[model samples]
Target chain A: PTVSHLSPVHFHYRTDCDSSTASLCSFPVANVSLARVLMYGQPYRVTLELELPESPVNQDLGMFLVTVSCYTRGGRIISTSSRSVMLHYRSQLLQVLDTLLFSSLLLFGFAEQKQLLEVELYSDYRENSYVPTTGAIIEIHSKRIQMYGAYLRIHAHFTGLRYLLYN
Target chain B: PTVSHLSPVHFHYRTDCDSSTASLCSFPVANVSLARVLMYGQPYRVTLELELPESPVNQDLGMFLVTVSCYTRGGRIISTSSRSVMLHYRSQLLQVLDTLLFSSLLLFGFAEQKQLLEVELYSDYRENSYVPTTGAIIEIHSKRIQMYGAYLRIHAHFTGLRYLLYN
Candidate 1:
């Protein structure tokens, strides 16, 4: 079977964090694109960008974590990766802070119904300690090639998810 | 990328048809297995067995068509094949009215949300004329391979819909 070109799509997750008040600690989803389709045993690259808030809440600096996961419709994790970053209010104020995270993930298995690619934002204050903030899930559809004699024409779209956070 | 053996799962569709009364013209689904996942550009084989009604209403006999289609989550046909059968009430009385259908399909592309395989039963009265009576649809999930050093274990299950209609 011949490999086809996947369609281009994007998904985003955003959240607001306030250390002074723990009442509003939930992370909210910003957007979802159910258009990205990924192939089994294939390599997919994701680009992530984050912008820090101009001023921290009472100058209380902390570390945050961004996690990306690929899950099936049954809520099974196929692939996942996370990155950690330290946020310093004084250092960020000196210049415009822009964080870019890149990862190449290899997905495994198959989803009979739908697959979800999720990006989660978490506030990790200490080692193995964190608070689940916000996340976004993008649905991925599946397709199979049509055997037309000796030639196979690609007749479908593929999709992937990317996240950008601005505070 | 390496291809893995998909987990075995079954989905069944059955319907009872009676020409005497059109009031109970409904097709009910019996079982569904959403564990099967299929990869893009993979070859899949399907076996179909259909049974005709034991006795026709007023001994009226006619021809019917059975169409099998593999579609993406976006409802695009990936592969399709149809068969025509002549149902004779008197001839079927001597033995069991069993119809066997088989075909091989190749999947192309990816659906980011969902993929469906549908089998439609139609009553063809004349040339280029047919009425859709009953059908069944099964969902297919998608997965990718993970690169682990030199060896790759099949991580996810690949599944497609196979229909056996016994009237």
Candidate 2:
């Protein structure tokens, strides 16, 4: 697979890293959110710029870089801009559904995060009313993707009735 | 999703490890092997064992770990063995065609073992051997094989039709 382009979307800082920089870019994230607080690891303010298309298989492509530049409180460029094109795909509907379901299960099962009272109530309801059929569908879809990749790469041509399901 | 049983059919190794001491188990294969050795890693051996059923659709399999067992040879017991049972539907005609054409090509392509005298003699003997066009037929056959671990794996199968004429 070839990446046509890489675009910088937005940036954000989780907490006040220093007095010089107030906030970072905040990109549009519907199903997932990536923030600077979790990303920043060093004392210097980092700005990352990435060149990438806005979308896959469509027009109006956006290509940019994520630049992490350091600045002192007195406003001086302390270091060269550290930029990287971090290519990430905008999740499709099915991918979003899969990640949300899987991550929620992970968090709940491990009791990693304290849930709000309403969210806990909703989780109890969902667990009690959940049907096993939903799991069957997820397994079917995941295995189909795996088998399609295997056969096309090693054995035969990419021609099948399953192609319609992808579109 | 669950392994029913583990069975061993053959062990072709020069080591002193036997089935009594080694744990006969089944595992998923994360890699594929061709006839090429690309990287200079440690010298390793591969062993495959599967029992073919007399009736339709049943196989028992296991593998012997060799890379990391201190009691055997290495310092660690590498119980992670990769294997997939490939079912071959061979016939007399298929064997003959393979030996005459495809096998010769695969052998020569990999090892460079074909003789110059054989190539010259075969080229002169069969100069005009292109077949005429014919009507086509398409067919698809699907089957399910439940190996110990695989849960209802579907093989979306098809056969390609062609002919070769020799004068």
Candidate 3:
């Protein structure tokens, strides 16, 4: 009942928010799993998603932009994306968010160096992608206030194939 | 030591910020630490401090407001405060912050309660206070454009006395 050579990891994180300040931020992590190598494996697809769960105590702070970022553990930004949202206080339950899939990640990563164990690791020059063992991080933001007690739950889905000596 | 019956708890936390997203947010925690009862204890003095240690790649987006909040675990905010900041790009290493000592905390705290251990914990008439034990939270925010790789270290200091029969 599985994709024999792949693993899908789901992550959930929250943001600290309030009714003042024009914005807010958070880091979605990618440690043990996102950083696994091919000798260990490779990542075929990556996606970041976010949600605003706090109630709008006021009217103005109800909605804002939520930005998500992916970074190397050492600080290199592998990729980034930002988008906007709407929260109708008297009517909305939860804010809607678009999934940010960095299609460029696979291309940029498939695009790399000794990073890869050997030439054996390269079969399709235009097809597969891998995560650097350095790991990755995602940051989220909300701005321009009056929302009062605003907090968010961000969900990330990382799905990819692994190296197999499969029997 | 700890001024007699008072307890001083120090909290150090960080923020996730970057070159994008007009703002960043973090919920400075106050779980087992900040919430103690006079039946457990009381919070007389409170202070919140923040730091900007991320390097700037672009010229703008180095600083903004760091708002701190104290709340009842159930969502009632006891009090709140907001302040502005400046990040001097190249000349600075770590952004300096003044200890935001919420002097009003004591007055406001001593200001009710017994929700106190009975008016018993309050003979001070002018000098003491207590924590609600519902635990409190401090929310930190950073805002307004382009600073490349920004992150922060926020510290909160809480001090007050607990009931004691110490001889």
Against the reference, the lDDT scores of all candidates come to 0.26, 0.21, 0.31
lDDT of 1 by residue, B59-88 (tens): 343444444444444444444456653433
- Residue A153 Cα positional deviation in candidate 1, in Å, after optimal superposition: 27
- State the local distance difference test value for candidate 3: 0.31
Give me the candidate number with maximum lDDT. 3
Error of 2 at B57 (Å): 19
Residue-level lDDT of model 1, residues A1-167, one tens digit each, is 32333223242222354435322233321222223223433343442333233343312322223344444444444444444222222222112211111112112222221212122222211111122212224221101111111110122222323222211
In terms of docking quality, model 1 is incorrect
- Number of the candidate with higher lDDT, 1 or 3: 3
lDDT assessment of candidate 1: 0.26
Which model scores highest in TM-score?
Answer: 3
Off by over 4 Å in 3: A1-167, B1-51, B57-59, B92-133, B140-167
lDDT assessment of candidate 2: 0.21
Name the candidate, 2 or 3, with the larger lDDT value.
Answer: 3
C-alpha lDDT of residue B34 in model 2: 19
